[PDB]
Symmetry: C2
Subunit: 213 residues, 2 copies
């Protein structure tokens, strides 16, 4: 889409115009944003589940619809296959959505039990309107790529358990790298543009881009 091309433009921008370096940029930031902390791929039966930094649980179903359980664990936002948003308590759900609500609770409680948080990025205070949802995702043999409505871009790698997140804060683009020890380092794209980067963050930046294209 237009969102995907925008992120890919700036990611490529920073990539072939950045110096060669020894280490990751020393200028790092202490802010919190929205990102995927836990994820679950059950696409062969139901769909793709993810948990956000504010503890929102979402499901991108195979039929195309979105379902989100809010941090209060009571309220459900449901966007259908064409985009009609319905908001209703999860406890008493219309009998059209019960099947989907059940699966949504199932994802929400698989993640908390079996799965572990992926980074020490500070839990976020929540609100932006409209609310974030996953517009598309794709998986290769090397990495998991997720792109959201608001343009936040995340790629998870399997073996290293390393991650890259590209977000928009105020007027800047941020790149956050999450290393082998689940630890957050956040840069500005501008600073990474002029100051270069490490060998293994640049390899991961190169790969994240190939997934977008």
């Amino acid at each position: 889409g237009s969102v995907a091309d925008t992120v890919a433009r700036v990611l490529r921008g920073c990539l072939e115009n950045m110096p060669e370096a020894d280490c990751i940029p020393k200028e790092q930031l202490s802010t919190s944003f929205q990102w995927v902390t836990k994820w679950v791929d059950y696409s062969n039966k139901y769909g793709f589940g993810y948990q956000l930094s504010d503890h929102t649980v979402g499901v991108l179903f195979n039929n195309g619809a979105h379902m989100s359980l809010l941090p209060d664990k009571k309220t459900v936002h449901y966007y259908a296959e064409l985009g009609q948003c319905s908001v209703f308590p999860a406890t008493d759900a219309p009998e059209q959505f019960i099947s989907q609500v059940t699966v949504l609770k199932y994802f929400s409680h698989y993640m908390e039990e079996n799965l572990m948080d992926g980074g020490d990025l500070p839990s976020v205070t929540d609100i932006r309107r409209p609310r974030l949802y996953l517009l598309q995702w794709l998986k290769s043999d090397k990495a998991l790529m997720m792109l959201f409505n608001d343009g936040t871009f995340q790629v998870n790698f399997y073996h290293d358990h390393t991650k890259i997140i590209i977000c928009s804060q105020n007027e800047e683009y941020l790149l956050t790298y999450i290393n082998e020890d689940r630890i957050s380092t956040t840069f500005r794209l501008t600073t990474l543009l002029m100051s270069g980067c490490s060998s293994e963050l640049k390899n991961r930046m190169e790969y994240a881009l190939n997934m977008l294209l």
Copy 2:
């Protein structure tokens, strides 16, 4: 990428030179070839496992290495990250490969449906015959795409459980469609080039190509 580019050349070939139609080409061929009957994605822990029509079980590990278990469940083929082939029994496996061997058996035993008496149990001829393996795969919210050693090309869709397989038996290109009700129909690409096809098989061919690109 040479393999992918070959399939993409002829598939785009047939796609941009085919009429628009209402129905499927009637001139069909009846043969069977090698394709994936079972697949299992555990990429964040092990890798991607698959079972072939000839009862070979393969694992594409996240690191890029391939490991194949022969139909007899006795012999292990190990192709290294770019193609160094190692062959050894699973019972007697070099202790360099165990971690990888164990995982291959784990997939092999997931592949195992519940055991039901019956015959004939699959058996191997040559203990050293280079069987095709997965070169790379990609998954979207709609489909799984797999590209193999010999250039065999397969796209599985989730909700429909519908499949497309592009093969080269020689040295012509075949497209096999396996529809919503489990029925295989195999055409020649030349036939699909000149006569067009159904509305959404053309839509499924279009999606398969976009996944390659």
